[PDB]
Structure 1
Amino acid sequence: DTYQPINCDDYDNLELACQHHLMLTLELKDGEKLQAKASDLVSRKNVEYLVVEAAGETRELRLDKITSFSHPEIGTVVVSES
């Protein structure tokens, strides 16, 4: 469907977490908790993409496929659903 841009708050936090080179917990639709690592965001044709290198499969997934994420070091951040 149509892509939507994320807010400035979570975008800054997501980049800061990736820039800090610390593993962050990520959850999927199945509810599995994985301490995955996100390298950076690649924007092709005005579409944002994310790759997880923790598992080694480096799958290219959209930024709208993540329910929520948190960091043990800092306060939890919730991505706005709309």
Structure 2
Amino acid sequence: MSMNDTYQPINCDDYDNLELACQHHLMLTLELKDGEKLQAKASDLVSRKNVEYLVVEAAGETRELRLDKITSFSHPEIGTVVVSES
């Protein structure tokens, strides 16, 4: 029935490049339904053959955030994004 979709876990193809650079500028603040909130220095994204997840470098340890469709991620003077814009 349907072959084309547009359901992204968090970050999209292009929207991920502009959001992470302009909206996150390396340092992003991740938040969860449990009112979680944490900023992370440096970050890039990786797209799986099936979907797409973000991968941020935590000082000296690689971390993967947004791969679980995190409720929302906010950035000072930018905004809050929940499991992909929708």
Query: TM-score, structure 1 length as denominator?
Result: 0.53
For each residue in 1:26-72, what CA deviation from the matched residue of structure 2 results, as whole angstroms up to 9, or x when unmatched? 11354331112352211131321222223643233454431111221
- The structure showing larger relative contact order (alpha-carbon pairs under 8 Å, at least 6 residues apart) is 2
Structure 1 portions without partners, runs of 5+: none
| Contact 1:68–1:79 (Cα < 8 Å) also in 2 | yes
Q: 1:12 to 1:52 in 2, by over 3 A?
A: closer
Structure 2 unaligned residues grouped into runs of 5+ = none
Shift of 1:76: 4.1
RMSD: 4.5
Q: Give me the whole-angstrom Cα distance separating, in 2, the residues matched to 1:39 and 1:13.
A: 11
